[PDB]
């Protein structure tokens, strides 16, 4: 099993502002058909609150690639400001843990 690289983004300016976040995170071309992608935002897992489709492979290289759809409240993503995404499977948890802040950085005291 080879876990490919795993990318995370949060919604459009304008998209939370809707009343609602809306997480996005790119997979890469997996090895195991089982691959899924786990959400954590803030350090919280974000699960049932997911829900995407799958993508076809490539023709031009047979390439694999698929897309998770993160479904969140205004409210809910507010409490929240960390956003990173990894790819699980039967092979390994994660390969590369990504994360980034939207707010402030995780190293200070309760808020």
């Keep these: 099993v080879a876990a490919p690289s795993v990318f ?3 919604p459009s300016d304008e998209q939370l502002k809707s009343g609602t976040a809306s997480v996005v995170c790119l997979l890469n071309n997996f090895y195991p058909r089982e ?3 786990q959400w954590k935002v803030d350090n919280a897992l974000q699960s049932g609150n ?3 489709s799958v993508t076809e ?3 031009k ?3 694999y ?3 998770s759809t993160l479904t969140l409240s205004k409210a809910d993503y507010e409490k929240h400001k960390v956003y990173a995404c990894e790819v699980t499977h039967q092979g ?3 390969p590369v843990t990504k994360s980034f802040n939207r707010g402030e950085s995780e190293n200070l005291y309760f808020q």
Excluded: R
């Design 57 to 59: 492979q490539d023709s």
């Design 65 to 67: 690639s698929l897309s």
């Design 50 to 52: 997911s829900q995407e």
């Design 8 to 10: 995370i983004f949060p």
């Design 35 to 37: 691959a899924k992608v």
């Design 61 to 63: 290289d047979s390439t």
């Design 92 to 94: 390994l948890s994660s």
